[PDB]
Amino acid sequence: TSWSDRLQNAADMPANMDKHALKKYRREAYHRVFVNRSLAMEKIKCFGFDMDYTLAVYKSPEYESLGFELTVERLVSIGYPQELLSFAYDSTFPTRGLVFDTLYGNLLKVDAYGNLLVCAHGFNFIRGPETREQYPNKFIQRDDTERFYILNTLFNLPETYLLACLVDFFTNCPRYTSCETGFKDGDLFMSYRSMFQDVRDAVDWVHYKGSLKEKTVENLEKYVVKDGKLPLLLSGMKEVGKVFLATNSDYKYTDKIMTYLFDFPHGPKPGSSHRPWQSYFDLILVDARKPLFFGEGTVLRQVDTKTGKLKIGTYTGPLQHGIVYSGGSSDTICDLLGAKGKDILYIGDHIFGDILKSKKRQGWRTFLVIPELAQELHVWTDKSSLFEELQSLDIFLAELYISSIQRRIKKVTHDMDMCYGMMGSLFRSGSRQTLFASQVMRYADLYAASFINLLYYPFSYLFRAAHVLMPHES
Template identity: 25%
Template sequence: MFLCKVISKCTLRLLLKSRFHRKQKIFIRLHSTRRLEEAYKVVKTKCQSKKLPKDVNPRAVFACNELDLKEVKVYGFDYDYTLACYKPSLDYLLYNLGRQTLIEQYKYPPDIKNLEYRPGFAVRGLHYDIEKGILLKLDSFLQIQFGAVYKGLTPLSNEEVLQIYKNRIIPIAYVEGHTKNASDSHTKMVQLADLFSVPEMCLICNVADYFEKKHFDYHPEILFRDIKSSIRNSHPVMHNIVAQNVSEYIERNDKLRQFFDRLVQANKKLFLVTNSPYGFVNKGMEFMVGKDWKEYFDLVIVQARKPRFFTDLSRPIRVYDERSGSHIWDRVTKLEKGVIYYEGTVKQLQDLTGWRGHQVLYFGDHPYSDLADVTLEHGWRTGAIITELTHEIATLNNPEFKKNANWLQMLTQLIEDHQDCEDPDEQKILMKWMAERDKLRNDIKYVFNEQFGSVFRTYHNPTYFSRRLFRFADIYTSNIANLLNYSVNHTFYPRRGVMPHEYISYFV
């Protein structure tokens, strides 16, 4: 009996000890999860108490590279979406003309006449996979942005994207081709980098969606080539329609003449190099500047066929006769003010004018065909006119966006600081934080564009378009007249960007 009492006491002690350890583990676990919950509350309170950032000036000029305007003697300009900014009506016009050409010349089903333009569907800078018929958004590391991949008008899930591409990162040869000047015929993926391509993207997706729903067996590359040709062949018709109804399609820029006056008074040279035909340009410039617009320019070249104008070594420059509307075949040995020129090359422009290197500042809207070659091959300084900045900056200045962006940054840091815990209950809390972060990232994306988000960012990385823009443009802004806010001797200084290894050492 004594032995039984001893055993019972031992058993009781073991039971009590076991209960104590269980309670201790529960207490430790509760204490551990409470630690995460408290950390969340502290960070959330700190975020809510933070003063929101100042608004970004929508008329500012932003610097990617230091640019001293005192060194600039010559100002050059593209025309479309640089000097002339178009109303949304032009997108509808190009879309409708392209759709009509598809039916009449390429014998596409008459039913596609019912496929209407979708404003706000696409953004500039997307890539179209001409092999697979997929429209998608890439970041600066050639990673696909999940949630921004479409076949026709249907968004593809992350699983479907990985099933198609086997990887989230696209090989550079697939995107850019194997040669330096890879054209559409060398690449499997084409970037739609100018604003004229926005209605083109919408037409591609609308027709592809129609074919998918009708279960038609179509070739994505043929569809792409046909629509690209249709839009391109529609441009002459578009030029005539716009020239006859300028105010319906072109935004009046009342400050453009003032800007030219400023440059001329500062003894700067001005030139215009555009792919558009003279009659079209003339009507637009008369509407925006006045009938004497040519007096501001020391050189005007139309139908330049950029980017070939910047890359070809030998292509004669010709004189355009305004009266007859034809080209004069005389050899051009000098470039004269008041004369309209046609085609040619940048080599001839430089040889005949002596305008070279950093004394030339050229503005365009297309990072590749306008800016890439002149900065890489000829050392010109460059400025990009990105009209989407108006919408992007308005979104950045929205107080709700600022709050969400601040909280996203702080929540991401919180997750990073606590992600290595191994306790299952702590992991559940982390998963809850991750779900909140995912929702925040989507909310921030949708306010720019519901399908594809910001022109300049994926969820956190710069887009592929941004990478090229920052590489080829010394400065960029939403409107050429924004330069009136700065003197002709102003120096633009880029902000010192924080590298990942510098982050903690800066006040950010």
């Protein structure tokens, strides 16, 4: 039961819009919207969406495995060894948000301050004192982008695993000699950095030049979650505000995916005429190039929706019905919809490109979709005795001012973390929060396993979070 299995199970349920049913339903963690800062829904005049992993949630592990297979196949085509073909995607290894260290070839899980929580070299999990040799302060400077790459998108899950597979393969393959910064194959030296760059290039190639999109669209039921409540929620939003799409994908792919997402024998509710996907949006913008979108953006272009090609020239005209935009900037949205930033709720899955940047650059209100949360929540609840023991142990140890029973803290930490996978929870390792967790709290005003959870609150709902006080104020 993957996170997408949870989501698709919830998706198959029809909406009971009886108000008592709704209030009961959202009380359950799985159908809940979680709140980091208060948000009066009544003040939202525009609801904006990302597509991939927001409206179109790709099924797991099938989609990751396809991405993996095609990336491997690309590496082999450019000359990586044939043994790569015997790799197979393993959903139990990667957790999202890990940092690849290109100097030493390690996957690192870090807290918000760059402190090392976990360090794996290939599939070898490096214990504390062993990590000191390479990380003397058990710390990385994560903004060193020449050295560190943060794998924080769901598209990065296959490469997260593939990096580890590669390091493991080269390390254990007798043709190569392991060195601190890469591998020696006679008169060739493959640095972890060049290896990392080849992988990044292959993932990009698969998405943009290869067969990933083709293979996705020829079996959308296998690869894409579908939910008849989507048009219900979007039609409700359109009654109280304006609705827009701003996606990095191109028009042709967007059209295939969105058409599938709305392909039911009905419109918003059962019994109603089907309406085309485009009719749910006051503004549709493709090729958005987020996060550049939230600064200067790119020139505004118009899509010829018949050919799927761009019309030649910059589009200088007004918002009209049936127009599809390409490129532009977040100011295009504000200007054409007559909105200020705080009137906008933008809904997406990219913690950096969607949520952090829209908040910091423009003051948009933010809703972060976290697909894995559908399953992380089940683990959090099922294993809460483990976390509470860890809390009591931390309390007890601190009150003590028999301390070598803090190896008990290491053991419980490991057991808890393993319930989530080899790289633990998205949100923490034991009692320590990840960078990702901290970013979620700081930049996502609201978050949930799916944006569909908004359906269970009225549009006048006031989402509340407690005020923060400084220690000297408390």
